[PDB]
């Protein structure tokens, strides 16, 4: 019935979009804000920010196609293809007004085409904790002076012959805990209950595969964004990144500067990759302030 | 016996600083030691060995923990494993210097021996891996061609037995996938050859030992930063595959910062597993390099 607890005042619902049944969680009143999660998680990573934004906004947090309780995409997993589903879902609830977009990890990959091709539909934009797919991702290190890299999963997930599925099947909880904790600075926030909920969700066979198909389409997304990036982004933009172990550090804003004309960036000390859960208070504060100012 | 011993060779053991090492020996004359790499054993040299034995005494040991060798008692860093390998070679050539041929992590486990005992090393052949130094931190996590060839560095080095946990029950699947994805000539890896390699490294202590070499890599980097203060002086050859899966120009490019007397070859259409993918041209280049002026 429900993989994750729905926050008070919110609603778990579905919408078919281009043949694909998307799951989403919606609440609040006012202009629309869409929150798009990343790999290893679902809409539920936003469950602490959602009631705060609901005080001024209509908040929708969908499950990415194939992840959570959304159906796999029927077109493909490249950024341009998935962005079609997400734009249509957001535009269905705010057809006359521009909306706000907050995105985390591969949520960036799956929305950037939508933003650059429909700038007038995007009022303000918040991107956190992942690169936009472009040639700069080819410079991430396979190995570092501190041991295992934070990005080796890019090639692991993208390997042919279903390597990752074959190796991870039957070990979904073990792998996800290793992936989450190795990208976290504050691992304390991931209780047994939270790790179980995420692991059970992405362990669904079609979800395990869908997770990696996003990475197998990464080269295709890079090529698409090389053409789309000819138009700079014009809406107000904020970037967030973890400054502790596991985060993007300075790279998040540095890359965004080549995309956005109007961008401010923050690096949150002692925080890793999973900002909404590791550093709920500072991150919620920065997002709420950015989207409230002048309104 | 895990792998068939070539006619005229013997499978034997020697104990070195408490660790019982396996090896295969044959021929007469000056000593050549052939050091294998990850995913394999001495047996990758079984085509070059009978050729070399016509002029040389050939010894191909199994790395500590791999094949039929016992795990090291000190550690898996380059300096630690080189002690076992240096003392083993000097047991068979205590009075004369010998030649060293090494492939993949065989380079990691012999370079400290070479730099500190140059008078013991007549000629040096290194193929298909970097010497552990800061350059390895520049390998790409992901490429314009898809999955990189080097991401296993971090996979193997991850904490909490990640690689062991995920590969357990899939040793043959993973090893076939790792080998073929690093090879240009996948046909030479028959069902029978893959089965022998998979059987060997699927031993619990061998699966772990395989990854411990990578878990010691940062320490090897720290060790080699000091050792490299002394350049290598003996004649040196490097070999690399120019096909999919190989080191390309980087093999010789890096060695130039280590050796004063080095020549390099990049073999077209060949991947990482030069002795098996491209036996004929590799064998010929090696035999010639160790035969000149002799």
């Amino acid at each position: 019935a429900e993989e994750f607890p729905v926050p008070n005042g919110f609603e778990s619902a579905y919408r078919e979009v281009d043949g694909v049944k998307l799951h989403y969680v919606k609440g609040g009143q006012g202009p629309l804000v869409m929150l798009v999660h990343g790999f290893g998680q679902t809409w539920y990573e936003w469950h602490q920010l959602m009631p705060e934004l609901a005080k001024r906004f209509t908040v929708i947090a969908p499950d990415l196609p194939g992840l959570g309780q959304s159906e796999p995409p029927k077109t493909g997993y490249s950024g341009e293809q998935v962005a079609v589903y997400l734009h249509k879902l957001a535009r269905q609830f705010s057809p006359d007004r521009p909306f706000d977009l907050v995105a985390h990890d591969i949520g960036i990959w799956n929305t950037y085409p939508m933003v650059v091709k429909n700038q007038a539909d995007i009022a303000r934009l918040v991107y956190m904790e992942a690169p936009i797919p472009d040639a700069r991702i080819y410079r991430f290190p396979a190995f570092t002076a501190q041991g295992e890299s934070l990005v080796w999963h890019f090639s692991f997930f993208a390997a042919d012959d279903r390597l990752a599925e074959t190796l991870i099947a039957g070990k979904e909880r073990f792998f996800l805990e290793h992936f989450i904790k190795s990208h976290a600075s504050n691992t304390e926030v991931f209780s047994e209950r939270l790790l179980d909920l995420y692991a059970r969700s992405y362990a669904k066979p079609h979800s395990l595969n869908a997770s990696f198909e996003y990475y197998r389409a990464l080269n295709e997304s890079v090529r698409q964004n090389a053409e789309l990036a000819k138009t700079r982004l014009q809406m107000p933009t904020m970037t967030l990144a973890g400054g502790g172990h596991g985060g993007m550090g300075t790279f998040q804003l540095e890359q965004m500067k080549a995309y956005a004309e109007d961008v401010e960036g923050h690096v949150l000390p002692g925080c890793g990759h999973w900002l909404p859960e590791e550093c709920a208070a500072p991150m919620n504060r920065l997002v709420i302030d950015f989207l409230s100012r002048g309104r | 016996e895990e792998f068939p011993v070539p006619n005229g060779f013997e499978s034997a053991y020697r104990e070195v600083d408490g660790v019982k090492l396996h090896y295969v020996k044959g021929g007469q004359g000056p000593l050549v030691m052939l050091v294998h790499g990850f995913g394999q054993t001495w047996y990758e040299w079984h085509q070059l060995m009978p050729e070399l034995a016509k002029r040389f005494t050939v010894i191909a040991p199994d790395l500590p923990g791999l094949g039929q060798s016992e795990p090291p008692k000190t550690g898996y860093s380059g300096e630690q494993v080189a002690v076992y390998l240096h003392k083993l070679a000097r047991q068979f050539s205590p009075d004369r210097p010998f030649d060293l041929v090494a492939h993949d992590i065989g380079i990691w486990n012999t370079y400290p021996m070479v730099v500190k005992n140059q008078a013991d090393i007549a000629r040096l052949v290194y193929m298909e891996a970097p010497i552990p130094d800061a350059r390895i931190y520049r390998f790409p996590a992901f490429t314009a061609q898809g999955e990189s060839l080097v991401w296993h560095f971090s996979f193997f080095a991850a904490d909490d037995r990640l690689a062991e946990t995920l590969i357990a029950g899939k040793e043959r699947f993973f090893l076939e996938h790792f080998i073929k994805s690093h090879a240009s000539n996948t046909e030479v890896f028959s069902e029978r050859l893959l089965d022998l390699y998979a059987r060997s490294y699927a031993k619990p202590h061998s699966l772990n030992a395989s990854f411990e070499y990578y878990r010691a890599l940062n320490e090897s980097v720290r060790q080699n930063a000091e050792l490299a203060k002394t350049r290598l002086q003996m004649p040196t050859m490097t070999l690399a595959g120019g096909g999919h899966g190989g080191m390309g120009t980087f093999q010789l490019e890096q060695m130039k910062a280590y050796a004063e007397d080095v020549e390099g070859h990049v073999l077209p259409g060949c991947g990482h597993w030069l002795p098996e993918e491209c036996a004929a041209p590799m064998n010929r280049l090696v035999i010639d390099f160790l035969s000149r002026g002799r």
Partner: nanobody
Amino acid sequence: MAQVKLQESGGGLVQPGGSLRLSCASSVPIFAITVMGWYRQAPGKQRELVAGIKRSGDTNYADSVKGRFTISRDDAKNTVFLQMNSLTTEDTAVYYCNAQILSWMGGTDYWGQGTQVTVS
């Protein structure tokens, strides 16, 4: 040296609606090549990717040619083929064979000499 040499066959002049099959052979076994691809460049325009095929067998195509062009791999002939169906004047360009070989530090690009394709 050069780690691969590429030799194209095919091309020429064809009428709208017609077909052509391009060919690219590799000096090394084609399995040693990570990505085989076809690019095209018309005068005064940018070089663009048309089709690519990986060792796995996965193919990818440009939007303007999806459904009309087909890239395929003949391991015995060490050859990659580009079947070009339903040609329009908008497909007129010089078509280049492309080989990408991945090494540990990264890939190396190799290009063929190119063949002229004119649709008129």
